Enzyme design. Structure first.
Site, short mmCIF file in Angstrom:
data_model
loop_
_atom_site.label_atom_id
_atom_site.label_comp_id
_atom_site.label_asym_id
_atom_site.label_seq_id
_atom_site.Cartn_x
_atom_site.Cartn_y
_atom_site.Cartn_z
N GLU A 160 0.82 -1.20 0.00
CA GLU A 160 0.00 0.00 0.00
C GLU A 160 0.86 1.26 0.00
OE1 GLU A 160 -2.93 0.21 -0.76
OE2 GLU A 160 -3.89 -1.68 -0.33
N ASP A 168 -12.52 9.34 -8.43
CA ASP A 168 -13.84 9.57 -7.88
C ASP A 168 -13.84 10.68 -6.84
OD1 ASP A 168 -12.65 8.33 -5.61
OD2 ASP A 168 -14.38 7.06 -5.26
N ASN A 223 -7.82 9.78 -6.11
CA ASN A 223 -8.35 8.93 -7.16
C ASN A 223 -9.41 9.66 -7.96
OD1 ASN A 223 -7.29 5.77 -6.60
ND2 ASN A 223 -7.71 6.92 -4.64
N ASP A 233 -6.84 7.76 -0.59
CA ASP A 233 -6.24 6.75 0.28
C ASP A 233 -5.24 7.42 1.23
OD1 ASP A 233 -7.62 4.79 -1.32
OD2 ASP A 233 -5.88 4.46 -2.56
N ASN A 268 -9.36 4.44 2.67
CA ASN A 268 -9.98 5.34 1.70
C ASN A 268 -11.19 6.08 2.27
OD1 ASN A 268 -12.16 5.69 -0.68
ND2 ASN A 268 -10.07 5.90 -1.50
N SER A 321 -12.21 10.56 -3.96
CA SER A 321 -11.71 9.96 -2.72
C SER A 321 -10.18 10.04 -2.63
CB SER A 321 -12.13 8.49 -2.63
OG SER A 321 -11.39 7.70 -3.55
#
Ligand code: CL
Ligand code: NA
Ligand code: NA
Ligand code: NA
Lengths: 210, 129
Positions: free
Chosen positions: B35, B48, B46, B52, B59, B50
């Protein structure tokens, strides 16, 4: 006129599951058997995405899941259209794939990576240049990590023969890697512009890359 | 901060992740490797909207609040900022809820694709716990 348009949209939420999909369709091609082949594949991919959402809302709960897909025209010239489609799945962490198609607008051609080059040597030549780029990037920025010389992670060795690629408005070749493909997930989708001076004599010609 | 491998094993052991809901310590380290490369401050935005966050790349669509992910939940009820500390406590506690959400460690694609079905005890090897 050759352009992408939205042709189906699915937004829906239920229990621990959601989906938010915008799907493109290609219109304007003089060659309709290609235009329909292309558009058929975009729709099977959407249909698959809806299936996975319906499956997560059925039977026993299997945890939270978000599915997202959208699309963007990254290159739109008189000679060339290229379209990015993203497919993002989120449970604990996000997972993004980005796929491209690149169309020769004058000749109604869907370009493959392979068709740009005279023979298979492009695979090793591009792979090597990418390793050098990764190395230089890591050198310049200790916040950039690729699985290159890391002794605990399987390294990046070679691009695939049909590796995701597209062509920019300035006629450069770009190779794209999904998340987790060549690097830890925090790095996102990574891409590499291959300088033309590195591959010029492997090209069939200069219609596309120059 | 960037944990050393063994240093993170030792820390995850304290926080009771060894054999939590059945998953041996190597899995939690392996997960973190792929990760965040052990970087507590790693962030990834990302398509959308969102993000991480942190050493496990939790997320904001589901698990934490960052005030900029329209339409998301906050199941671990924490600001996303808490997942970027050098102390791992907050990320362990949210990870513990996530593995109990109903899918095991499968909720991490990184684990599924780089850790599952491998010799994950190796991420512990050489360490002194
Ligand atoms: Cl929000
Ligand atoms: Na991620
Ligand atoms: Na790909
Ligand atoms: Na949130």
């Amino acid at each position: 006129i050759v352009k992408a348009i939205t042709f189906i949209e699915i937004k829906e939420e239920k229990d621990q599951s959601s989906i938010d999909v915008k799907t493109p369709a290609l219109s304007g091609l003089s060659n309709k058997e290609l235009e329909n082949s292309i558009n058929e594949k975009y729709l099977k991919e959407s249909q698959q995405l809806y299936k996975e959402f319906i499956q997560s809302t059925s039977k026993n709960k299997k945890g939270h899941l978000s599915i997202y897909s959208d699309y963007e025209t990254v290159t739109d010239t008189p000679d060339l259209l290229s379209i990015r489609r993203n497919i993002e799945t989120t449970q604990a962490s996000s997972y993004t794939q980005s796929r491209y198609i690149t169309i020769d607008k004058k000749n109604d051609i869907l370009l493959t990576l392979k068709s740009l080059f005279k023979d298979e040597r492009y695979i090793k030549v591009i792979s090597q240049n990418i390793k050098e780029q990764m190395k230089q990037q890591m050198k310049e920025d200790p916040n950039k990590i690729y699985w290159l010389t890391d002794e605990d992670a399987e390294p990046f060795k070679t691009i695939l023969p049909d590796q995701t690629f597209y062509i920019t408005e300035d006629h450069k070749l770009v190779i794209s890697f999904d998340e987790y493909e060549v690097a830890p997930g925090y790095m996102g989708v990574t891409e590499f512009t291959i300088p033309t001076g590195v591959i010029s004599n492997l090209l069939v010609g200069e219609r596309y890359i120059r | 901060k960037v944990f050393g491998r063994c240093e993170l094993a030792a820390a995850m052991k304290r926080h009771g992740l060894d054999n939590y809901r059945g998953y041996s310590l190597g899995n939690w380290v392996c997960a973190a490797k792929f990760e965040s490369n052990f970087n507590t401050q790693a962030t990834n935005r990302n398509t959308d909207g969102s993000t991480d966050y942190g050493i496990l790349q939790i997320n904001s669509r589901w698990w934490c609040n960052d005030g900029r992910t329209p339409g998301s939940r906050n199941l671990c009820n924490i600001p996303c900022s808490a997942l970027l500390s050098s102390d791992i406590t907050a990320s362990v506690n949210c990870a513990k809820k996530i593995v109990s959400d109903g899918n095991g460690m499968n909720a991490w694609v990184a684990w599924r694709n780089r850790c599952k079905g491998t010799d994950v005890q190796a991420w512990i090897r050489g360490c002194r716990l």
